[PDB]
Amino acid sequence: DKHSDEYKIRRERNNIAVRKSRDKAKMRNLETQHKVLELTAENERLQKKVEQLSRELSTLRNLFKQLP
Amino acid sequence: DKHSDEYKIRRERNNIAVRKSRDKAKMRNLETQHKVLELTAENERLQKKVEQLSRELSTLRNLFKQ
DNA sequence: CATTACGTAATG
DNA sequence: CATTACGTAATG
């Protein structure tokens, strides 16, 4: 059964499919890791934008009250 | 090599460690995908603030050219 | 073919 | 002990 040629071919093909499936799983993990870095960078960009608008706004609010 | 008590025990212990190591890997992967969902949720939060501030600013500039 | 539990062995 | 390449077998 294990010395039959059909078992040997069967194992050859599955071994190839296993390697391929494990390597695609790696890549999906790397992509998810890449996503964390993209969200983090865009997150940093967005809070700095919020901080700019917050400043521009708060600056104005304080000078408006600055004149009865 | 095998059939020895030495080898049977060594395998029992490695098998336990493998299972542990694979379960811990599952969880770090789980954690990483938890992180994308929080960065995504926090992203949407920050976008909506930028938009609210942008609106508040923009209405101001427009009303000033009267 | 693709996926995954389970195991072996080499290795840090 | 923990990690990982490599393989087997059951299964979708």
Numbering used by the authors:
A (entry chain A): 268 to 335
B (entry chain B): 268 to 333
The paper states:
To understand why C/EBPα/β prefers recognizing the TTACGTAA DNA, we determined the structures of C/EBPα and C/EBPβ in complex with the TTACGTAA DNA, respectively. Our ITC results showed that the binding affinity of NFIL3 to the TTACGTAA DNA was ∼ 2-fold weaker than that of C/EBPβ. Sequence analysis of the DNA binding basic region showed that the A87 in NFIL3 was substituted by V285 in C/EBPβ. By comparing the structures of the NFIL3-TTACGTAA complex and the C/EBPβ-TTACGTAA complex, we found that the longer side chain of V285 in C/EBPβ could form extra van der Waals interactions and an O•••H-C hydrogen bond with T4 on the T4/A4' base pair compared to A87 of NFIL3. The longer side chain of V285 could also form van der Waals interactions with R289 to attract the latter to form bidentate hydrogen bonds with G6' in the C6/G6' base pair. Structural comparison showed that the shorter side chain of D320 in C/EBPα prevented it from forming additional hydrogen bonds with N321' in the other monomer, unlike E111 in NFIL3 or E309 in C/EBPβ that formed a hydrogen bond with N112' in NFIL3 or N321' in C/EBPβ from the other monomer. On the other hand, mutating E111 of NFIL3 or E309 of C/EBPβ to D resulted in ∼8- or 4-fold weaker binding affinities than their wild-type counterparts, respectively.
pmcThe CCAAT/enhancer-binding protein (C/EBP) transcription factors belong to the basic region-leucine zipper (bZIP) family of transcription factors, which play crucial roles in tissue development, cell proliferation, and differentiation. In humans, ten C/EBP transcription factors have been identified, including six C/EBP proteins (named C/EBPα-ζ), and four C/EBP-related proteins, TEF, HLF, DBP, and NFIL3 (8, 9, 10, 11). The bZIP domain consists of a basic region (BR) and a leucine zipper region with a sequence of heptad repeats. The leucine zipper region is responsible for the dimerization of the bZIP domain, allowing the bZIP proteins to form either homodimers or heterodimers.
